[PDB]
Amino acid sequence: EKELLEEMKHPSRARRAKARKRLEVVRAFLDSGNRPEWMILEAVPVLPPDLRP
Amino acid sequence: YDGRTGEPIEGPIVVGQMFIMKLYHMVEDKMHARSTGPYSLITQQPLG
Amino acid sequence: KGEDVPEPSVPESFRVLVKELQALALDVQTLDEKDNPVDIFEGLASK
DNA sequence: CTTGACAAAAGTGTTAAATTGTGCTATACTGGGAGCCGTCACGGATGC
DNA sequence: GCATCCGTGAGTCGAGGAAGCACAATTTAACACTTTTGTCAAG
Numbered sequence: 001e002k003e004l005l006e007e008m009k010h011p012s013r014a015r016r017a018k019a020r021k022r023l024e025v026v027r028a029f030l031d032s033g034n035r036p037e038w039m040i041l042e043a044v045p046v047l048p049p050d051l052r053p
Numbered sequence: 054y055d056g057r058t059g060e061p062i063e064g065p066i067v068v069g070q071m072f073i074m075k076l077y078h079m080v081e082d083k084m085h086a087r088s089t090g091p092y093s094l095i096t097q098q099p100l101g
Numbered sequence: 102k103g104e105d106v107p108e109p110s111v112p113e114s115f116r117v118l119v120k121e122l123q124a125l126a127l128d129v130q131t132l133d134e135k136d137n138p139v140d141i142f143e144g145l146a147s148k
Numbered sequence: 149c150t151t152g153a154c155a156a157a158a159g160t161g162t163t164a165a166a167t168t169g170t171g172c173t174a175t176a177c178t179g180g181g182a183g184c185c186g187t188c189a190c191g192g193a194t195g196c
Numbered sequence: 197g198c199a200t201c202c203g204t205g206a207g208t209c210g211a212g213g214a215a216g217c218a219c220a221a222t223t224t225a226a227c228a229c230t231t232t233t234g235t236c237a238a239g
Contacts, residue, residue, distance in 0.1 A: 047124040051117060053094050083210090097113045101210090 001026050111141050 004023040008016055029036055054061050091100045119141070122129045131139045140147065 041126060045124050045126060048120055051095055051120060096117060 001030065116141065 001023065004019050004026060007019040008023070010016055010019070087099075092098065093100060119129050119131075131141055133139050
């Protein structure tokens, strides 16, 4: 987040647009309390059998 | 003439013989009601 | 019995929604006024 | 409040069939196969 | 900045519903014997 904020001061609009999009995802993970590695599954949940009868 | 009063209709009426068909859509096959009945497996909502 | 129908409860389709969302590894939780979890499964799914 | 007698009825121990799971075949074989096809619109996405 | 591609979206009810084989390991069907109710007289 600190590097993205520093790059947010770049004069180029495309650089600021790219940094903002990355920072928005970073801010979402920081505020929510989720961990980025949770996006990779180590255990797959299995639906209850009555919902897949 | 009007069969209820016996008086004529105030204007002459186009009367003739026309060929009319009874179509396959009948209210006997379409009327349906339901208070309770079968329910779906997963959603448990009524069937259709 | 000649009585007025009772107050309804949570639909079973919403329960199907939660479990199908959980099968996608998404933690969907129903909260109360104080942000505390509320069990809509009547204790039947808690270990 | 019982007290013995009996008669099924469920429980237990062997016992064999019947079913189910697994290993094994020795001439030489060495890169798949159906896709084939009449919309049009938007937003977005790196790419350049 | 600009084609090009990828993705997503496009009304509601109804009514239609191609090996075999041997051998081992495991489960299951039958009995045979107890142990336990269930049901009687006796009170």
